[model samples]
Target chain A: TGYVGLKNQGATCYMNSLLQTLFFTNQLRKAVYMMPTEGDDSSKSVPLALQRVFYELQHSDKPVGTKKLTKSFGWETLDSFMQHDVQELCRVLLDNVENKMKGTCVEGTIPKLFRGKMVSYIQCKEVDYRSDRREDYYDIQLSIKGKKNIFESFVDYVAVEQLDGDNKYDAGEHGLQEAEKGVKFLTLPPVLHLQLMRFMYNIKINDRFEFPEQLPLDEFLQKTDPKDPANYILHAVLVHSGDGGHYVVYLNPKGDGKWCKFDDDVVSRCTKEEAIEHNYGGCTNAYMLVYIRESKLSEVLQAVTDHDIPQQLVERLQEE
Target chain B: MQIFVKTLTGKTITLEVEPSDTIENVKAKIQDKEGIPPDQQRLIFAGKQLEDGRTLSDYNIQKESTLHLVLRLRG
Candidate 1:
């Protein structure tokens, strides 16, 4: 991946790192390219500024500046120095992009790429009463304190809770009944964003936490085909150093068996050890991890051809 | 009793439904109002999705309560 760097404007290092991760998210880039930005005002449009920045990152030789994109968020120079909440920024940017893409040919692309379903259930011990809930998740926030790795987090997440003892469900007709509550995954996204809860606000836990390159989620799924793919490969690792410290992201563009480190205005080829091992918490560790389902890795990394780009973008670039 | 069926976008539909009616019956009622097929609609109420086979009373759906009507995702 011959991707250009994003210029660091102090706290924008975090923004730069997060953005680099998004750029390497192939479908997102294509969807952004597919957006109809012709009618959008050049000054305040988030999608337009994003399209411009993405286009620059893909084509420009020099480090691309994020000033235009930040201004799209209605921020000034002082805001540039403000500590970047990458997760919050991710949600805002994604929400804006989702709205901009609505009713377009690429309207469902975001949901298709990221949306996942989970079911929360309360099963009664007797009286034949049960409740099942369906909820959608774009990303999962896993608090990795006592948990050594992601698997442990998943285990803890779905662990059943018994509503027994003095606590019982008011079954209306049955008065009270024992019940068990639990949550399980019903659907999985092709691209999964796992935001590790590394910072506990008033307190921060810094230590070595293990994560695997390949993740098998069969155990965590509620129900599915026995042969259905339930595995994910690490695509990117975003490390948050210190308290609002420096930000660095390592991305596996195209899953080409190659990894690149994007730290502010610099991009370098790095080893697996450099990408995975060194970032195991102790000051600067992985805060956000991205995964691509094994079965759809190629599809997730599908090429965005010139034809896929919106005509507005094509002609705009032609003018320049 | 009357319950509102709120579409993803539109003038919210007010339907006269019975507590005894299954969620599927309401879906059919929606089909009668709009052309959306019963199979294509997913109704959610009271924070939990309404199951086709379950009655409105089972989920404790109340009069004037709003049920979200979303298009069922297709493979």
Candidate 2:
């Protein structure tokens, strides 16, 4: 679909299975009233989900397009109205992404290459991607909770060396101060970025962990009681693959980290089990942090696997 | 309708929902706030199967809808 179609559609894109399933249900047109049956202030009818409601009205053997019903009802901005619903689709997809996977599924090469990059989500912290246009970009702020082995010295050394390498002395004193802060003003060139992507992606999902193979993920909440699983968000910046590696941040709530580097498959199985038996869910919310040049999404995510974490971080993480 | 959502810490996100929205749609919005994905999620709203296609309309949900959303964590 073109931009207009894209804009007008909800996250489900109409092409998604949810809409298809709903259409099959043949129940969308049934009259629906707000809940809490006893609640008052029912005088004014909040706009009905008019589209679906109307669909039910004419639902014989054939369904009528909502465009007709809405036009008759004098609702302004049908395009935007549909767009709003589409936005809700995006909203639902995002929720499914955050609530189910507990992590993002990086598809396509460019985005995968730029995974793990940091993005800020603080209300006022604006991250303007004013740099030269690139292919795909994402900044993922991975909060290193739990027992993270912070090699401060190694991190500091990398910081200093990286800054020194970018001798933008022409910017004068202010540039020097900017360099001093641990701010990464310079981006890892494409090739180097790819390497970093591969490096992080290579982290052995199976072996790299600070604890047993799989902790009782169901019992994880007991460790961090009262914290909402969705609150532990992965603040990531991602770009559409078509954006030519352009980067945009993605902020979604996250779950507590359990089995830090456990296999996603293993955890998914557990969630399914809970849904089947006790109706509970489990998520590891565990991911890796890597810095790389732009060129290795395939080699990094799809290809690397469990044996690669060591060589990738030898210089920093594995230093003696 | 009321749907209960769970937190990363297994806390509950109990809230009501309009019958117009499906659980999938609502889940997506809640996931954005919670940061979990649907595929990794295992949610049960009001003792019914709250899988992907289920909607608040399906369950006749109203005020006090507790939709429990659990994201299977990934490492």
Candidate 3:
């Protein structure tokens, strides 16, 4: 069966595009399917709603209705129609799913697959003193200011700092007059979500931003182990065409390096070249990028073994 | 082998585990000592969380090497 189209439901592309991409993110989809449902009805649960959508998507040979899934977002009517950012929607989906998995299987799945820790540090030039703190992030946002690739922009975004600032560093005890702020990745998630900031205020920048199929973060990543694989393979891309225009997604559903473009109801198998063409600057450009750690797939797949999804659902999804 | 586990509060505790023991086993020890269950405990060393299925030697975790434990919250 080809890719299933999601019912637009009027201005629901924001939610629809994300759903199509999520369907391809195997680890997250598997975990969402295996989500434990206590006494609560699966119909009302977000994860279950998503699982239903995935089941329909993988099993049925036609477009799937997302009305039930949209209700999970508390949207009662189409009057709430508004274009939203994909990254924001991604956060909402992950948060809702994680909230459901709170005591159930968080440690082994949600955080393991999506949560990344960032350590930001400030160093004083005069005192040779440094202060550091740890923060966790679900996605990495890239700045479009520099003439660099997505990975380079990522490096600059993390290590960005104002060197000649007065209000710089305060390490509880004292403060640094001239401090340099730098950020590093303390921990990388099994799956990485990277967003390209293309919209500014009400104006949207249709300029081009380039990203590679395979990204290496060794230069920017904090050298915590000096041994862990620093590579990430691109999996899915959420693209925005016009201001308040239609949104579409391009995904490599099979990690075999082949790519496909998903435009609302239309699904076309595309070559890796066509996929990279989205890297060009234009009205329709890559807005959100998802990468999976090349090294942790085995470990992540192992976690799925403990999950007890219904045999029927697995069989339905497995059925061609 | 003895390994040191440091909590976010700067509390450091020492535990003994065989080289053959998995990182999950170490998390169980921390659960007994810090009351943080294995799932909530993210034992990070050299920047990456130690995989529960992997052995300590697989991560090259040495004696006295501090494993920073970050407690993940539901929200």
Candidate 4:
């Protein structure tokens, strides 16, 4: 009677986006990974596609706009092209996601899921661009599905800035700032940036507290059950090799029951290591998951694939 | 029953699928009919995966429950 909206909850959209990017990443990784271009050509394809779609939607025949650029592909005027292009782009996104992930993703058509008064996409444009060259104005598209006019709840994250140099977290050892200029230079689309930010937030670091340091390894080892090796879960959380590389013990001694915090220097060191060790890859664009489980070995493995654990963790578990 | 899907841009495809067909099977059927390329096809049902061998009877998919598709053209 009123209106249907696009569903953007849970794994519905995120997984779809992840799958889409992964395939594009895989293709790019295969074709150009060996050569490694100097600039930001790495994110050219998918982001460009997204940008193109954002532009194309404005001219579509649905609701608003003068409907330009739709003529070159040649349907009739810009309007027909807009209509065809939006749907076509959606199809392209779906196909790439599916192919990159293999056939393990959804089985049927993605458009069908939109029918029956569910997904609603709002057509609006905002200057989602960088302050410099590409103003990156996006069709701040809102896809609301399911719930009846409860559009007040869903929120999209935007990364505005990145702080890079010496001393980011404390004095600033390269942190991202939430500003248009900051994010633009980083060369990430807001969608990819948001996805990575969300993934980072999803990482459960409840165990990041320091283990009682000065507690001798021998003493700790003697008290624990040797049979259940996982009980002695001792790990040094290190983000190595950037500006500085250092290992700050998660469990240090003389450390009161109070967890030992990673000093600014230690933080700098670990973050540096992680940046360098992991090659300062697209930190806010890639998916990340930190899984902690209390289950038997078999249960953990099943849980990995059963639930959408990070690809890296799944690979690591498989090796074991 | 048979259903036809035409991407407003590409070919209009006709597919013959049984009520026993899972979403996956339907996609395969579409791929076979359209030459849409397996890698270029993105299929979705009720916003989820179409498990292999999972039949329409499993979820009791109603009429006109279309799978949204997006694809890249090779030909």
Candidate 2 lDDT, tens digit per residue, A83-114?
21211232233233223222323222222222
Q: Write the per-residue lDDT of candidate 1 for residues A1-320, one digit (tens) a residue.
A: 37789998767877788788888887889888878787466668888888888888877899999987888888888888867656556755776787788988789877788878887666788779876657676776665677777888788767776656544544556666777767789988999887676643224567677778889988889886566678999999987776556778898887865889988888999888888888876577887889998888887888766666677796786675
| DockQ comparisons of all candidates to the true complex | 0.03, 0.02, 0.02, 0.02
lDDT of 4 by residue, A1-320 (tens): 01111122211222222222222222221221222112223124332223222222212333112112122223344233221112223334444433333343333222221111222111112222222222221111111222111121012112222312221111122222222111111121111111011111112111111111112212212133344332211112212111111211221111112222222112112332332223213221111211111122122112111223233432432343
What's the best-to-worst order under TM-score?
1, 3, 4, 2
Model 3 chain A: which ten-residue window has the lowest total lDDT? Answer: A299-308
Task: State which candidate has the highest TM-score.
Answer: 1
lDDT top scorer: 1
DockQ comparison, 1 vs 4, better candidate:
1
Interface RMSD over true interface Cα atoms for each candidate: 15.6, 19.9, 13.8, 23.1
Question: Which pairs in model 1 have colliding backbones?
Answer: none
Which of the two candidates, 1 or 2, achieves a greater lDDT against the reference?
1
TM-score of 4: 0.22
Residue-wise C-alpha lDDT for candidate 3, range B1-75, written one tens digit per residue: 545564543334556677788988888988887777676566656434567699998967665455666532110
Local error of candidate 1 at A120, Å? 0.4
Query: All candidates' TM-scores?
Result: 0.76, 0.21, 0.73, 0.22
lDDT of each: 0.74, 0.26, 0.67, 0.26
- State the local distance difference test value for candidate 4: 0.26
Least well predicted 10-residue stretch by lDDT in candidate 3 chain B: B66-75
